[PDB]
Structures are given as C-alpha cells and as structure tokens.
Short mmCIF file of C-alpha atoms and ligand atoms in Angstrom, two decimals:
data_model
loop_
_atom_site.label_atom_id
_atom_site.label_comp_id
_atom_site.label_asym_id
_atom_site.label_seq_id
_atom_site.Cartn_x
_atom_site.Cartn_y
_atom_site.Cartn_z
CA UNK I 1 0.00 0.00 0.00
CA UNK I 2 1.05 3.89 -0.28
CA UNK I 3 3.46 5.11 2.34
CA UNK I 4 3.31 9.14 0.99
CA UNK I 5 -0.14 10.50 0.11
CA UNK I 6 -0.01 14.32 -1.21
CA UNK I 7 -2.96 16.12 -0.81
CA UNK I 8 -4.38 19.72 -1.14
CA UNK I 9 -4.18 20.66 -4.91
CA UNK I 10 -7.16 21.56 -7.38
CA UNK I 11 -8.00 24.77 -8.95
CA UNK I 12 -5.90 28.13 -8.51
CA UNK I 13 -6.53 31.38 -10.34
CA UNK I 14 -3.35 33.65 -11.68
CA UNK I 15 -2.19 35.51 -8.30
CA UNK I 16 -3.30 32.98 -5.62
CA UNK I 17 -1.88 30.62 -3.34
CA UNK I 18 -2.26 26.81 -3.43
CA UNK I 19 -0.76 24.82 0.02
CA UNK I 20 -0.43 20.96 -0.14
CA UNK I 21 0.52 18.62 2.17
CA UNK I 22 1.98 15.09 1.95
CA UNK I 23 0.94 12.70 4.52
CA UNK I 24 4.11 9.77 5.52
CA UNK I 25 2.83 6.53 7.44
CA UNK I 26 6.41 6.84 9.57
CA UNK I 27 8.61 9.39 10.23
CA UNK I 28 11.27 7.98 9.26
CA UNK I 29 10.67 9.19 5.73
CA UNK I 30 12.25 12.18 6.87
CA UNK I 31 15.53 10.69 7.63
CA UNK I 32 17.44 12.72 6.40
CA UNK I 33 15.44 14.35 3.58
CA UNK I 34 11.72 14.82 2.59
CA UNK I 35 11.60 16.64 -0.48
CA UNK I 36 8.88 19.00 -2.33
CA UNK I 37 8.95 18.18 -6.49
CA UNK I 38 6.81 18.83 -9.26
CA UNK I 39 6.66 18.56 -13.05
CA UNK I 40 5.60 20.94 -15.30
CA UNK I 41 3.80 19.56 -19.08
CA UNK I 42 6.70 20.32 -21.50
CA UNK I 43 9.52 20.38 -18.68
CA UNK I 44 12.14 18.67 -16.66
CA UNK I 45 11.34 17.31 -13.11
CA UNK I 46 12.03 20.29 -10.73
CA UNK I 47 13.00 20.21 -6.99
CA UNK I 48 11.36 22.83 -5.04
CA UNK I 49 12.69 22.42 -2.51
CA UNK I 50 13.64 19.99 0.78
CA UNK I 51 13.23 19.95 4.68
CA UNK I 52 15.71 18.18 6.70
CA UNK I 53 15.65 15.90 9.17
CA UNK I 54 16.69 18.83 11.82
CA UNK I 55 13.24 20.54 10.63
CA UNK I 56 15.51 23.34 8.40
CA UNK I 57 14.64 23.88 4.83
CA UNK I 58 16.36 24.64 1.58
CA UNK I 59 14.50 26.01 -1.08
CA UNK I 60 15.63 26.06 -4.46
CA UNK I 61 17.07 29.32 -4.58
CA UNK I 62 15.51 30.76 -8.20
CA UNK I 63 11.61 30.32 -6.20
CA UNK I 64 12.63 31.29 -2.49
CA UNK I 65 10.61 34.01 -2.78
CA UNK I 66 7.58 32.26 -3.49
CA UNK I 67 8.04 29.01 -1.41
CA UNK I 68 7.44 28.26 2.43
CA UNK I 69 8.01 24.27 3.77
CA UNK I 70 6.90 23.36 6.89
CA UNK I 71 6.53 19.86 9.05
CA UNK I 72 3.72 18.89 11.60
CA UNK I 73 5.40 16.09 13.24
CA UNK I 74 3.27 14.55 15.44
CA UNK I 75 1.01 13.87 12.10
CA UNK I 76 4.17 13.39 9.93
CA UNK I 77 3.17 15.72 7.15
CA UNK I 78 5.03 18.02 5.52
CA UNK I 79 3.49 21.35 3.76
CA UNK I 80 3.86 23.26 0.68
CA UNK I 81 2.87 26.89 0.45
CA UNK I 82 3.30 28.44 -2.64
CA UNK I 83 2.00 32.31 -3.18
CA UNK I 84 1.91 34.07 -7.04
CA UNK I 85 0.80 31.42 -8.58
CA UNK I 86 1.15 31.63 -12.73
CA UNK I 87 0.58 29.39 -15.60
CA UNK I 88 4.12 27.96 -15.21
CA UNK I 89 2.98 26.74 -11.74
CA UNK I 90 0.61 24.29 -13.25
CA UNK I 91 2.36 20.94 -12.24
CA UNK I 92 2.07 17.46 -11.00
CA UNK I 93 3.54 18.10 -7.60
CA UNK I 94 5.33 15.37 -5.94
CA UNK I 95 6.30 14.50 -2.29
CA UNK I 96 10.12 12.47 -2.79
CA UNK I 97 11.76 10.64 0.42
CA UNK I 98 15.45 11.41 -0.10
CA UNK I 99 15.65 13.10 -3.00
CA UNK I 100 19.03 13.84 -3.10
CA UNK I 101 20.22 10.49 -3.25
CA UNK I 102 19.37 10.19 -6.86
CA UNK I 103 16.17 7.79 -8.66
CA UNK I 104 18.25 4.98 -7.04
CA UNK I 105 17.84 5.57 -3.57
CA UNK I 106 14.31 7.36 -3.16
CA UNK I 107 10.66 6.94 -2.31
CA UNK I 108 7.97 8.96 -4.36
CA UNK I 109 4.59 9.90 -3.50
CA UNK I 110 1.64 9.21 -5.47
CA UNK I 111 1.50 13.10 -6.79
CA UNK I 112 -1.28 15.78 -6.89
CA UNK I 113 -2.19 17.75 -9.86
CA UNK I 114 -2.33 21.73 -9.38
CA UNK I 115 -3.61 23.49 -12.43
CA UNK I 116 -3.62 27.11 -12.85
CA UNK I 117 -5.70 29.16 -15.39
CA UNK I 118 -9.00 31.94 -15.30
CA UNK A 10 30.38 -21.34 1.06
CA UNK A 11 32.22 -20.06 -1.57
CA UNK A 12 30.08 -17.92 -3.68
CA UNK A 13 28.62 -18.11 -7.68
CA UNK A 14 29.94 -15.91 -10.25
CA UNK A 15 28.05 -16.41 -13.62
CA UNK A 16 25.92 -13.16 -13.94
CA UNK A 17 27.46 -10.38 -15.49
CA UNK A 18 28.00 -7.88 -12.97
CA UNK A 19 24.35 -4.88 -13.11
CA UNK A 20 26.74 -1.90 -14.08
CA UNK A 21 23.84 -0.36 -15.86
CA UNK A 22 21.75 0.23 -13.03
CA UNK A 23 24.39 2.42 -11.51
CA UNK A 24 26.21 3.94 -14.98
CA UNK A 25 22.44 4.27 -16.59
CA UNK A 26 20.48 5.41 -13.64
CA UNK A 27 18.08 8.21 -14.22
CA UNK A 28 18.85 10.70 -11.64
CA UNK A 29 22.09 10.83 -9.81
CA UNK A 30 22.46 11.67 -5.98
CA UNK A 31 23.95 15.36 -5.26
CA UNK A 32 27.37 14.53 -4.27
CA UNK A 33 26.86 15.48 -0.37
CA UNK A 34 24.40 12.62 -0.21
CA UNK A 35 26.70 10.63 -2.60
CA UNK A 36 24.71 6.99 -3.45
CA UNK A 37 26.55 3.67 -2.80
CA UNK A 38 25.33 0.13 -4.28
CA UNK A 39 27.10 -2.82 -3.31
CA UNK A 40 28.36 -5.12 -6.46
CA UNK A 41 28.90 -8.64 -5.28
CA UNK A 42 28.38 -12.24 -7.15
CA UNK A 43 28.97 -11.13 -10.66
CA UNK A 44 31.52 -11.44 -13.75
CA UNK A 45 32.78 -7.85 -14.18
CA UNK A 46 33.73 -7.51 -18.05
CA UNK A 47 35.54 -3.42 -18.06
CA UNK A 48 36.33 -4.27 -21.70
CA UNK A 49 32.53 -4.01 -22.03
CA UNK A 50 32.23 -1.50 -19.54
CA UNK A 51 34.62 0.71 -21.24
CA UNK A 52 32.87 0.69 -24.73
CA UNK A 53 29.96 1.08 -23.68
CA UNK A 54 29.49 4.91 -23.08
CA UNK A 55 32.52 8.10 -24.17
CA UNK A 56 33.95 8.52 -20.98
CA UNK A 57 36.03 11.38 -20.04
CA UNK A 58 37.84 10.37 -17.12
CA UNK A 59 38.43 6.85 -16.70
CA UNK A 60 41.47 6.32 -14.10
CA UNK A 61 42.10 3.62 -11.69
CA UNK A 62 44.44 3.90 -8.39
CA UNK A 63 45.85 0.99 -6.53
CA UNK A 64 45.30 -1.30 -9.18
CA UNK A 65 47.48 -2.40 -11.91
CA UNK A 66 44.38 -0.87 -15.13
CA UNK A 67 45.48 -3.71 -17.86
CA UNK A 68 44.85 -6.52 -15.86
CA UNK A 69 40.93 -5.54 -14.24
CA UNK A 70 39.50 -8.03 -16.18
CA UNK A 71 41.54 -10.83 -14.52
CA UNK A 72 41.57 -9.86 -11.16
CA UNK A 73 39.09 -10.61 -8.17
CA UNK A 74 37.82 -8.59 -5.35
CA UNK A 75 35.54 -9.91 -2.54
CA UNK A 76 33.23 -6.89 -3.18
CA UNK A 77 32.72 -3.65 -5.54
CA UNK A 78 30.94 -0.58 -4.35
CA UNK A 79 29.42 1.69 -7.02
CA UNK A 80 29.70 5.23 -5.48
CA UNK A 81 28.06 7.58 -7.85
CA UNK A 82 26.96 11.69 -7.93
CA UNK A 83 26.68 15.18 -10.27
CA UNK A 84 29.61 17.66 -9.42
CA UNK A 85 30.42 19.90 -12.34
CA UNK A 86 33.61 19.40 -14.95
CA UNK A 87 36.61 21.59 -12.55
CA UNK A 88 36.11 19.75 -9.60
CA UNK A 89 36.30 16.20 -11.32
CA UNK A 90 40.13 16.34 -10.51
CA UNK A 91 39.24 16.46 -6.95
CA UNK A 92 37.96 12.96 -7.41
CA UNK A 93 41.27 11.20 -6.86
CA UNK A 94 43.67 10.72 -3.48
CA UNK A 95 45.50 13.24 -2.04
CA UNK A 96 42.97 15.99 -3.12
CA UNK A 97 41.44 18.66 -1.70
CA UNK A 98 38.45 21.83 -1.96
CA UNK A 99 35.01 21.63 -1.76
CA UNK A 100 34.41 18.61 -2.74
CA UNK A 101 37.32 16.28 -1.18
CA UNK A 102 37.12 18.01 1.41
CA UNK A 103 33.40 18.41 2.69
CA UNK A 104 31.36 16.00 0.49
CA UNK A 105 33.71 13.23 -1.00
CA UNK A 106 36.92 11.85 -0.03
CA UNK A 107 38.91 9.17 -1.34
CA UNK A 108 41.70 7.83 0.72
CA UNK A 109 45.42 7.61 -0.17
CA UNK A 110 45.89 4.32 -0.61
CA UNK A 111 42.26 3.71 -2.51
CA UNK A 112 41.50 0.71 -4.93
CA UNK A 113 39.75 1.48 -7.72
CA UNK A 114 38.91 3.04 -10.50
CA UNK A 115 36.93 7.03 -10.91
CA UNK A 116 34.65 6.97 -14.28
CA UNK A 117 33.17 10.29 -15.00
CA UNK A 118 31.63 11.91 -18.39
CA UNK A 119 29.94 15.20 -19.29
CA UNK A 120 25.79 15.13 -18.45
CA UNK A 121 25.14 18.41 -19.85
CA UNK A 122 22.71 16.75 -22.59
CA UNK A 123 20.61 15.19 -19.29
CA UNK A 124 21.34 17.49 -16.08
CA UNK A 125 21.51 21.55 -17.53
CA UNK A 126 17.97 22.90 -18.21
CA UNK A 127 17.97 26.41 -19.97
CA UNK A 128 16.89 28.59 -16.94
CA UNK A 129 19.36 26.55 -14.96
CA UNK A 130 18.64 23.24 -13.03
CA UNK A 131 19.09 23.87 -9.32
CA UNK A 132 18.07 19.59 -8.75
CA UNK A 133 22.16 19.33 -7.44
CA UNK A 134 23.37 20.32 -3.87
CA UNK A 135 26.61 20.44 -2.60
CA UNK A 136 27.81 20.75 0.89
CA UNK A 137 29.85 24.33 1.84
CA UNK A 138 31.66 23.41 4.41
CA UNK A 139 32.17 22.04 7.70
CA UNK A 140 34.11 22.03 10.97
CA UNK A 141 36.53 19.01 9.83
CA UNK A 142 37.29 17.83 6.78
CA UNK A 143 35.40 14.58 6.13
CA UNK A 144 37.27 10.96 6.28
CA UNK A 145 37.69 8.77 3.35
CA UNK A 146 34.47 7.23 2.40
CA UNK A 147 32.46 9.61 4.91
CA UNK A 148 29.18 10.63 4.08
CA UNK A 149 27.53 13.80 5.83
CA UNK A 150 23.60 14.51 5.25
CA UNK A 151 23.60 17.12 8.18
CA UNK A 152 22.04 20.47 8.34
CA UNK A 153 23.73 22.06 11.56
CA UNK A 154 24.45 25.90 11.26
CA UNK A 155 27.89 26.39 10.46
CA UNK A 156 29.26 29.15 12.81
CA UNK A 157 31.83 31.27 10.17
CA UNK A 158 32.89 33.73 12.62
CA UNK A 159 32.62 34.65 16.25
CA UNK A 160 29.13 35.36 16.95
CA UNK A 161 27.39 32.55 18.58
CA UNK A 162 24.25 30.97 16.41
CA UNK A 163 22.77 29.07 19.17
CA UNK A 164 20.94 26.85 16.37
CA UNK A 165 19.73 30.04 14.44
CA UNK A 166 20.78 30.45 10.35
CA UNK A 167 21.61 34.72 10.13
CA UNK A 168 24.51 36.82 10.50
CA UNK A 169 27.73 34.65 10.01
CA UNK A 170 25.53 31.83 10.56
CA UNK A 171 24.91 29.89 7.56
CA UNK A 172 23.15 26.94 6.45
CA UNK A 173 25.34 24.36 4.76
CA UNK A 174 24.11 23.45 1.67
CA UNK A 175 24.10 25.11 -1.84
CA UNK A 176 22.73 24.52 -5.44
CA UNK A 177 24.67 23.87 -8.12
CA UNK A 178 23.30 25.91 -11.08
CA UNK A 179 23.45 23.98 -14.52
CA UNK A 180 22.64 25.67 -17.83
CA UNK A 181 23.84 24.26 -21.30
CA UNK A 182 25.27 27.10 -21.91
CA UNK A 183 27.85 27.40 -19.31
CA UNK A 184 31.55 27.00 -20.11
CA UNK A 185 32.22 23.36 -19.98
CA UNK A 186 33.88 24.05 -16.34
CA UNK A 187 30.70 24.63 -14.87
CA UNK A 188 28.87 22.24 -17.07
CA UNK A 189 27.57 18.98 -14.86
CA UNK A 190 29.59 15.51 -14.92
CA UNK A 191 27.87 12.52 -13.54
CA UNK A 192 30.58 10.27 -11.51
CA UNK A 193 30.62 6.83 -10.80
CA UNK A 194 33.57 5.87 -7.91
CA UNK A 195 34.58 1.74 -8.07
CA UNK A 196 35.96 0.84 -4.65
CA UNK A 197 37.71 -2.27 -4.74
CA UNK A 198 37.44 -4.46 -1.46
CA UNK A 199 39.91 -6.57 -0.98
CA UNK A 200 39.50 -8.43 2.16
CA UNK A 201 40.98 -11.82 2.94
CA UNK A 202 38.01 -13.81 1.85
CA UNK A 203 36.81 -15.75 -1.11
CA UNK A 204 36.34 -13.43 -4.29
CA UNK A 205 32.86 -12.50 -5.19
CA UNK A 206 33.75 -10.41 -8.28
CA UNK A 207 36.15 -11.72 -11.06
CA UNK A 208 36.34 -10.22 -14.49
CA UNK A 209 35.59 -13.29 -17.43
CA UNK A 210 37.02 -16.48 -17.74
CA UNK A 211 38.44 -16.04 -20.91
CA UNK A 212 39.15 -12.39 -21.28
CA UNK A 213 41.23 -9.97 -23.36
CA UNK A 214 43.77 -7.57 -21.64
CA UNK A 215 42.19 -4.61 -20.42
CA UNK A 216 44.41 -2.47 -23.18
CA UNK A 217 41.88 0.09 -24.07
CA UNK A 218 42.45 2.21 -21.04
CA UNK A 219 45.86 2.88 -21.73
CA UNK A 220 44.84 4.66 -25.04
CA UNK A 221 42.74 7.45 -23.79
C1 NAG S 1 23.47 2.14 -20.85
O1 NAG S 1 22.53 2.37 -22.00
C2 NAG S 1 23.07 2.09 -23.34
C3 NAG S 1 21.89 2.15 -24.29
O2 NAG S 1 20.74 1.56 -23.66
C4 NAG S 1 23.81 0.73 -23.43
O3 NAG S 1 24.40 0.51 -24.73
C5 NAG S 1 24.86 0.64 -22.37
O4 NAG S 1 25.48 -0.66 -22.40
C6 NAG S 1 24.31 0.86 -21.01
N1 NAG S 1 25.47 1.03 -20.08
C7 NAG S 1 25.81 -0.03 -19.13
C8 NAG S 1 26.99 0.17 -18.18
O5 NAG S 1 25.19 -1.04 -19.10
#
C-alpha cells in the first residue's frame, strides 16, 4: 500500500496561493530528507525544494521568494505553500523521500495535480 | 560457502540510472556475485575520465575482489580532478573523499545533454563546508548551522551563521567548467576472503584504457 499521500491541490486562479501537504505513514521518511517536487507539461522534473531531518529547509534558490516548507510532526506531514501562482505553476507536484540520493535511492509519493488558469 | 559468479555484474543500473544523488548525499550500491567484463564496460558509453588507483588498469578483467561498491553523484567538470587521493576543496574536502591508498577506478563523463535545463537546473546540492574535513568514504547529510565567525548561532541560520548546503546551477550554456559531470567511484574491497567479483574467464587484456 502507499506510504506518501499528497494532498491539497485543485483549482488556482493567476495571483493565488495553493498549500499541499503530503501525509508519511512513519517518520522515518524524513531521515534525512523529505523533499517537495513537481513537473511541469513540457519540462524537466524540478525540486522545489527539501526539509531536513533537523526541521531546516532549503528552497531552491531561483523560487525562495515564493516558497514556504513546513513539518507537523506529530502527524508526519510536511506542507507546501506556494504564493503568485502563474501558468508555469501548473504541475504534478510530488512528495520524494530522499531526493538527493538520486532515482536509485528514493521513495515517491503518489502526486497531486495543481492546475492554474481563469 | 564459496560464492557463484556467472551473472554479469548490473553496471547499468548504476552507470544508466536516471537521476544521480547530489554529491553530499553521494549513493553507494554494493556489487557482489557477478563477472565484471571493463572491456565491455569501457565501450559502452565516451567517458572522459576513466582512471584507476591501486590497481594495476590492464589486468581488471583478470583480477578478483571480494566486493565492488558503485559510489556515484553530479559535481560539475573543474572539480572532477578532486575525485582522486590526495585531493582537496570543496568537494574532497566536505562532500567526497577518497583515501590515499584507494583501490579502484573514478569513471566520470559530461551530463550536460541530461542534467543543464535552460533557466538553470538547481536539482544538485553540494555541501559548503564544515568544521573538519570529512574521512575517506564519509558521508555527511547534516544540516547544523555552520558558525563562520565569532558570533554565537545558538541553532539560528543569520549573521555569520549559515546553512550548509548550496545549489549547483546547470545551464547548457555554461563553459564546460561549470557544465555537470555525472561520476561513478569503483571501490575495490579486498579483504581476505573468497572473491565474489572476477572479471571473465576467458578475457582480453584490459588495453583500451591505456589509449585514452
Ligand atoms: C546504458 O545504456 C546504453 C543504451 O541503452 C547501453 O548501450 C549501455 O550498455 C548501457 N550502459 C551499461 C553500463 O550497461
């Protein structure tokens, strides 16, 4: 069965916000990395950006601006807040277990579709 | 019980692999039971750095090792050279090191056709620094503050307070220093212990690697 369920994720008009969460059955999945993803139709897979076992985040530094990551741990979710929003934004968005260790050595989520348009 | 070795040894899924770790996180697979053919190996991709250490290269595909880790990771094209013993900066010293006396071989080619995105891909971290340098075969996938002067952080990221990890930025574009190579580090155990990996039965010399 699924271990990492995102959730949140629909409908978004130019200029709002979306915030998604990703649900893990153990917290482990954040040792040492739980990762924010998403892919764009036309486009490479692109990290957002990552929170850390510790509880810091790095966020890919070209969308800091519009990016916030946080972790509820007692419910072992991690969120996504995203503010802005444009038609670039529209994305499968994916919550990725260890992301920096490369396709070989990570644990994907299921995804959630965010689509942006009038 | 001494062991089988029929199957050719799975370099793809480490050479082939569709996303490689950032190099601070640095992903190892164990390579055990298997025929390891580097006449094959060699010829099967353009390789632009293809050295071994420790090792006499000519005669890897009759020699025997009781195990083969595949260490593998994106740096970009100057710091390949740090991938070697006896190195150091950024990367030997804070997210990969190699000892002095290492066995094996470092295989790296340019991955600018599958990591560089125009806009940049920001997908590959390295670490910044740390206290100590790391020791051979060390892997660190810590986020402590790193305190670069002489205020106290106290856990807090700010003024000379800084959080350890950086993107790489990858664009075709750049100048080939800057351009991403994809790295795959053979480590050559060599414990006293019956031989898991042997290169084929009947075999040529190795001789290709000399004429690079
Ligand atoms: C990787 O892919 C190419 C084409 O599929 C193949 O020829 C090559 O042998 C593969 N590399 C390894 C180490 O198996």
């Amino acid at each position: 069965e699924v271990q990492l369920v995102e959730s949140g994720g629909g409908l978004v008009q130019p200029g709002g916000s979306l915030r998604l969460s990703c649900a893990a059955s153990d917290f482990s999945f954040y040792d040492y990395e739980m990762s924010w993803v998403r892919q764009a139709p036309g486009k490479a897979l692109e990290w957002i950006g990552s929170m850390y076992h510790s509880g810091r985040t790095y966020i890919n530094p070209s969308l800091k601006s519009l990016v916030t990551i946080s972790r509820d741990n007692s419910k072992n979710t991690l969120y996504l807040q995203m503010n802005s929003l444009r038609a670039e934004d529209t994305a499968m968005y994916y919550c990725v277990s260890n992301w920096a260790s490369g396709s070989t050595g990570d644990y994907w989520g299921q995804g959630t579709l965010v689509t942006v348009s009038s | 019980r001494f062991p089988n070795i029929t199957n050719l040894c799975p370099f793809g899924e480490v050479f082939n692999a569709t996303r490689f770790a950032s190099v601070y996180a640095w992903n190892r697979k164990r390579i055990s039971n298997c025929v390891a053919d580097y006449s094959v190996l060699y010829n099967s991709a353009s390789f632009s750095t293809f050295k071994c250490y420790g090792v006499s290269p000519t005669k890897l595909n009759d020699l025997c090792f009781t195990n083969v880790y595949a260490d593998s990771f994106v740096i970009r094209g100057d710091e390949v050279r740090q991938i070697a013993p006896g190195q150091t900066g950024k990367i030997a010293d804070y997210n990969y090191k190699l000892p002095d006396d290492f066995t094996g071989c470092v295989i790296a080619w340019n991955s600018n056709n599958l990591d560089s995105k125009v806009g940049g891909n920001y997908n590959y971290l390295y670490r910044l620094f740390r206290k100590s340098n790391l020791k051979p075969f060390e892997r660190d996938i810590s986020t402590e503050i790193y305190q670069a002067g002489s205020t106290p952080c106290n856990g807090v990221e700010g003024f000379n307070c800084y959080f350890p990890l950086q993107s790489y930025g990858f664009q075709p574009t750049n100048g080939v220093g800057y351009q991403p190579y994809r790295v795959v580090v053979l480590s050559f155990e060599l414990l006293h212990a019956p031989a898991t990996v042997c290169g084929p039965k009947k075999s040529t010399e190795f001789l290709e690697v000399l004429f690079q």
